[PDB]
Structure formats: structure tokens, C-alpha cells
Symmetry: C3
Subunit: 330 residues, 3 copies
């Protein structure tokens, strides 16, 4: 293949580049020199490793297409990514829509996705809410009276006009669930690729601490992502999970020039079998790293292992094969 597949050396590059190799592409990783051995020795998936944050000129010379990882913007910055001259797999317009709280909320609302209700006025609280001062210092409130007592105790607020820099959301209790999707622009087909539960510290460690021991300390709960655990869902939940993905894609077609490639809806499942979404990640997510050898979902419909990384490379190949590569790049 003339086209080479390139990605930033973090997040999901091992999976992406292995998938590319499996589909007959030459591969490029670019990033920190510290991690070069990971991609060239321990897991030799990168044919070229460039020790630079964003080697635009070298990437153009190598006829690269960049597959954006789930931390691509974090490492490069939104402006650099939006203005990059190297072709980008996916729609670069999505980056603002997935990251700006207001745009994200608008997208999810248009897509008819269940999300926590936001309260602009504490005096409107009628069911338990989570209060987010600007995980740092998050607390629950039952009602307006409870809220104001806690605003005084935790935030020093003694007058209503003094309240500032807070978010108040409907509190939704459920188990974390992260469905991984792929929308093929070539085939105009949505797929469910896999599902995981993100493994987080210290939040996933506190359950091992008895209540008595916890209560002696002021707990500082954190949600740092450490890894991922494979799951499957109850089968009867799949249709609504898939329909949610379809609606997100459709809404993006209207709002931002489309959504294609991998994405994920991040949320929880309540005891009443409701999927409530906290965030959309409109790129490959780290949970897909479990499924290098396929998943319980891909093995229902393919005769070979298909990771999200491989699926991306399959899409790029099929685009080239059908003379429509420009359609999947921005």
C-alpha cells in the first residue's frame, strides 16, 4: 500500500499499529523517545518511530494518514490538530463538539440520549444531586436546605449571592459501562465493537476498605484511569445501546459534518435497566485495547480477530479499494 498508517505513541497505538500491520499497511509511531522500545522491541508494531511530538513534514513525506488516539489532543493541543496538514482519519470538527461541555450537551440532547439533568438554581433541587465545586470536593445534596447547609460547611457560603464556580447535576447511581462503537462511512453501517469497564484509582480501591477504617479519614476520591476490564452486557440491553449509537451518528451528520470511525458513550446502567450517559468520547477509547484478538461481539460476525484498531485499518483499506479515501479523511 502507498498509504502508511501513523499514530501518536500513547493511549492505543499498539492496537492501532498492530491492526494496520494485519491489514497490510506500513506503520509509523511518533512521540516520546522514552517509549520507542515499547513499539519497536517489546511489541514490534511500528516500522518507523519518529522521536517528535508532531513531525508533519516527515509524515507527509511518508504518505501517512494519522489515526487519532483517544489522547491525541491532550498531547498536541486542539489548534495544532485542527490545523494539521497530514490527513486525519475521522472528522476533525468533532473534537470541539466532544470536548466543550455545552456543545457536548447539545449533541447528546439532539441525539435523544439520556443524561443527568443539570440544575441552574439550587433552590430547584427536588431529588438527590451531585455538587461539583471547581472529582475534587464532590458531594451529594438531598434538597435545597441540605444543599445550603453543605455549601456553608464545605464551601464557606453564608449568603446565596456568594455561591459561585459550581455545577449541580442529577445524581445517577449505576454500574460503569463503556460501549465501543465503529461507524463505517464506506459501508454506512454502525457496529458494536466491544464493551469494557474502565478501572480507576483510587475509586475502585475504596470498596476494599471497611467503612470503619474509611471513616477515620477525610476521603479524597479520585478517578485516574489505570486500565480496563472486559465485559459483556445482558443481551436485551444491546438494542437500546446500539440505537443510542445510531442517534449520535445521525445527530453529528446534522451538526458537525458527520461522525465516522470509532467512538464510545461513557455512562452507567441503573437498576431499572436505564443507560445514562455522562460523556461522549468521539474517538478510539482505551477499553478497546483488551480486544486485540477480537471481542465477544466481533466474533459473532467475523471469522477472524477484529480489534477497533484492525477495523480502522479495514475501513482505510476498503476506502482505497473503492476509490473513496478522501471521504474518510479530513
Amino acid at each position: 500500500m502507498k498509504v502508511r498508517i501513523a499514530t501518536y505513541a500513547s493511549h492505543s497505538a499498539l492496537q492501532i499499529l498492530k491492526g494496520a500491520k494485519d491489514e497490510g499497511f506500513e506503520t509509523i509511531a511518533f512521540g516520546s523517545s522514552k517509549v520507542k522500545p515499547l513499539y519497536t522491541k517489546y511489541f514490534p508494531v511500528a516500522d518507523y518511530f519518529i522521536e517528535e511530538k508532531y513531525p508533519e513534514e516527515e509524515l507527509l513525506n511518508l504518505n501517512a494518514v494519522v489515526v487519532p488516539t483517544g489522547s491525541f489532543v491532550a498531547h498536541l493541543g486542539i489548534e495544532l490538530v485542527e490545523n494539521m496538514k497530514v490527513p486525519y482519519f475521522g472528522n476533525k470538527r468533532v473534537l470541539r463538539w466532544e470536548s466543550d461541555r455545552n456543545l457536548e450537551r447539545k449533541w447528546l440532547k439532539k441525539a435523544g440520549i439520556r443524561v443527568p439533568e443539570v440544575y441552574e438554581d439550587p433552590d430547584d433541587i427536588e431529588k438527590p444531586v451531585i455538587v461539583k465545586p471547581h472529582g475534587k470536593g464532590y458531594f451529594l445534596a438531598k434538597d435545597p436546605e441540605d444543599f445550603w447547609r453543605k455549601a456553608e460547611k464545605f464551601l464557606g457560603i453564608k449568603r446565596k449571592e456568594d455561591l459561585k464556580n459550581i455545577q449541580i447535576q442529577e445524581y445517577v447511581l449505576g454500574v460503569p459501562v463503556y460501549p465501543h462503537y465503529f461507524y463505517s462511512k464506506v459501508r454506512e453501517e454502525l457496529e458494536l465493537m466491544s464493551i469494557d469497564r474502565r478501572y480507576e484509582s483510587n475509586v475502585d480501591a475504596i470498596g476494599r476498605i471497611p467503612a470503619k477504617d474509611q471513616l477515620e479519614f477525610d476521603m479524597d476520591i479520585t478517578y485516574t484511569v489505570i486500565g480496563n476490564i472486559p465485559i459483556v452486557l445482558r443481551e436485551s440491553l444491546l438494542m437500546d445501546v446500539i440505537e443510542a449509537g445510531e442517534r449520535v451518528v445521525k445527530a453529528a451528520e446534522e451538526l458537525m459534518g458527520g461522525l465516522w470511525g470509532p467512538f464510545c458513550l461513557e455512562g452507567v446502567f441503573t437498576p431499572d435497566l436505564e443507560f445514562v450517559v455522562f460523556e461522549i468520547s468521539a474517538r478510539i477509547v482505551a477499553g478497546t485495547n483488551i480486544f486485540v484478538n477480537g471481542s465477544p461481539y466481533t466474533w459473532l460476525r467475523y471469522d477472524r480477530p477484529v480489534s477497533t484498531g484492525r477495523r480502522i485499518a479495514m475501513e482505510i483499506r476498503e476506502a482505497i479499494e473503492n476509490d473513496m479515501l478522501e471521504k474518510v479523511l479530513t
Copy 2:
């Protein structure tokens, strides 16, 4: 094959029908129209989809054998299932024995399976018990005095003669474990297929909530099944897990005309390495859905991926091949 494999469109139908396809059968899903796309588009495992709860006449015409899912009776009702004219993979007599609390207890006792002791009289409590008023309102009691104090506080009981509508069981603390078995009637051989931990809401979410935050609320703990997480057991535990399965099968041979096909013992492992069983599910369980591409157990003994769904289809094929199909159907 003349025989087609049919199942209700929920619970584990994707796995069942993929397994059937893998073994060279034509496949039928039947159920809600809402879920037709799941089985024909997103995961195209159903050659026929019938939009009816139980299309008996159409199934007979299609020469179907029905593989009962783990929620088959829930959707159809016990009477309809017991009287169905379409051949059923497994022993239909098992349905009452697995579902009636007294029959289930008798089965497990005959099979020498460790289960929580039941207390008929609260005044007999000598170790911690779980009290189940008729997960709704479950609480622990240490001894008779503690029980009666709590019966007054939680249930309004002020006289011993006024106590009604409760179950009292030995409280057994351990980690949830769900071994998945398959008994081949064709080969007269029990297999361990896989093992999972069922993922439940809100119970599996509360560990993420610090004790201090929990204590401000009356917790309403629920056990709604959301998904499944793959596990393996400590190897030295396998023999007793397998022996338990053998005993369950043997006991069924005496009591109810036999047990064959998939089943699962649902319970916990204590810190003293004891498997304590809460329930028997005498049909395919949703935890097997993880293992479409085989499991850490099947890959010890097969040269190809074998899910429980595939194993069912293998049994039906081998029955046909050996002119003994009638032996595995009721």
C-alpha cells in the same frame, strides 16, 4: 441439516445461533420486532426471524428444535413451555425443580451441595443470619435478641405471634462465582465450559461510594443483572466445583428424569475456600456470552473456539450423527 435450531430472541440468542451456524445448522430467532435488527443486521446470526412470542406452527413447519435461553420461561410462562409441541433441547421437567424453592432445596440437598442453612424459628439463631422480608429490605441479625429488636424497628413487630412473610438464612460472606457446566447426554460426560462474575446494579456500584456519603442515605440495595465479567478460579478449587456438577446431574437422574445440556451453580467462595451455592440455573446462563471465542477452560481441551452455544449445537449434531436425537429432546 434437516433440523434447524431456534431460540427466543433474548438472553443468549446471539451466542446460541452463532454456535448453531458454526456447526452447519440453519437458525431461527423468534421474539419482539424491536430486536429483529440485532439478530439480522448488527449480528446476522438468524436466518429466519419470526416476530411472535411463540410461533409454534411455523416452528414445526421449519423442523425447529428450540434451545431454551436462561429467560425462556420468564417470557413465555411455565405452562406454555411445558406443553410446547416443538422439540425442546434439554429436559422440560427440570423447569419446576430449578424454580420452586422447595424442589430446588431438595435437589441441592440430594446432590450434597453446600447451601445456606434455613432457620424456621428466629429463636434458633446462633450465628449471623440474613433476614429476607417479603433484595427488598434485607438485613442481618446476630442473635435472637438482635433479630427481635430489628423486627420491631424495621417491620413493626411487637409480639412474636405477629411475625410473618419472612425467610431467615445463614449469612454467608464470599465473592460471587458462577461456574458454567455442560453435561453431554450423547457422551455421558460433564464439562466445565467457563466461569464468570455477574455484574449487578446497584450492588456493584456502592463500593465506589465512600462510607461517609453512604451513611447520609437509607441505601436500597438492588441486584439487577447488567452484564458479565470473565474469571478463572484458583486451579485447586476446580475439582470440587466439577464434583458438585457431577452430583447435581446424578441427583437429577433420580429425581426428574435427568439433567443434560448447560447449567450453572450460582454462589460465593468464602475465605476458607468453600463454595456455597445460593441457586441452580438449570439452563444456559448469560455469563457464557463472554465466551463466543471459547474460554480459558475450553481452550485446554479443544483446538477451536467452543462457546456453550456452540457446544449445544455440537451435541445436537452428534445426536443426529449417532441416530439418537430423540434422547436429547423433550
Copy 3:
């Protein structure tokens, strides 16, 4: 092959012997008669089963090489293992270094591995510590004053000179993570094989118990190993995990005549992305049992399923092929 692969019938023998078979070796399990069916009927991976703790003469006659399981010394005792005449895969000198608290600490320090700080004097406590009286009776202390109050309340200590039989360690809160490594002496190459989270009772069950219910009882937290759950790590964490493994191997080359074959660093990941190690297991660990059909890591670099058991057999084969078997045996 003239050489046969033998292992004790527990811990990881199914995986080890399946891996051996996959690489063209004849296989031997030895151990308790009770478990013979596991290795010969339910999972037929053992060509020979010897119903003895350590059948030295029979093993020599069968030209066996013993692959030590992760519980080998537990069942046989250190002296028997150190003096065994049957060739042993790995370095027998490592057994003391991984098991003696002081030697283990020296090894990890030489290897520059982050470990909990040990306090010899309670009056030196300046950050939260875990106190380990000789999981039985473990508690946290904030500072010297808190420690002495608790030493009085829990341990009956009323004078400083009366304190004895305790360990005091820096308390490190993070999520359990168990990377599985393999060092090839034949290739002089370290590999990351897989990663798991060990499933433990009753510790992993207490998160399901609401704080209110816990507080009515004196909790007795236990860490009995029941099983294993597959995970992957955040990709950016891999380099430092791998570097830790390299340093452990290098340090062993100096201290104890080398480390080769499988091993595992057991620890936690903090919210600041720090891997803190509690223990080294310098042999195959049970978490590798999940990966009979390979792992998310091995499928990045092999075209076939490679468990740690298979990798061991691959090493023995390659040693034989290159006339250097003596180099990997002690």
C-alpha cells in the same frame, strides 16, 4: 522430544501442561490422587499422572524437567525443592530471595523498585501507615499519637517498651495490578505476557455491603485468593512496568545467579500513576491461567495463542534446538 515436561498437580498445571503439549512434549502431572481426573479426564493434558508428592526416581526415569508452579514450595517445602535431583526450569536460588522478607526487600531496593517505606520506630510516623500485628488485625495510624492510642486499644500496649511483634509500613492506596513477565535466557529478552487482577475473599466482597450494615460488626478482612480477572493497563504505563521487570532481572543477575522464565510484580497503581510493589513472585502466577488462548499483549507480537505455559515450553524447545538446555535448568 526425549525431554518430558512435568509439574505438580495444582496452581497452573493445566496451563503448563497444555502449553507443553502444544509444543510437542509429553507431559507428566504429579500430586494428589483426588485431582487425577482434572488432568486426565476433564482436561486431558497429562500423558502420565503420578499419585505422589514428589516421585523423584520415576521422574528421572521419564527424562522429566520440572516446571515449578507458583505453589511448588508450599506443597513440597524449600529444602526438598532446593535438593531435588530432577532438573528444574528456572533458578532454584531465587526461591529464598523471593520468600525471605529481608532478601526480597534487598532485591527490590537493588532493582530500584518503588515499595512501601518501612518504619522501625512508631515515633517516626509522619504520614499514614498500616500496622501489621503478628491480614489479621491490620489497622491504619495517622501519626505517633494515633498509633499509641490504637496500640493501647487494640493490642493492650500501655508502655512503649512493651510493643513487640509488629510491622509498620507506609500505607499506599491504589488499585491492585499484577503484571506477568517472562525473561528468555535463550534470547536474552524480557516480554510482558499478560496482566490480571487477583480476585480475593472476603476483601472483594465487602464493597457489596453498605457501610451501615458493616458498622454493626467487627470486620475481619481476609485476602484468600479465589480467582483472577483479566485486565489491560493504560498504554502509557507499560514502559515503566516493563522497565521495572528489566531492573528486577538485572539485579538478580548480580545477587543470585540470575532470573529467567516467568515472574510477576504484585502491587497497586496510585491515582498519581505510580506502581508501588508489595511483593515479587519469581515464578509463574495464577493470573496467567486466564490466557490459555493468549492475551491482549501476546496477540500484539505472535501469530498464535501464547500462554505463559506455552512460552515456557517454547523456551525449553528452543534451548534443546540450540544445544543449550543446561543453561535454563538448575
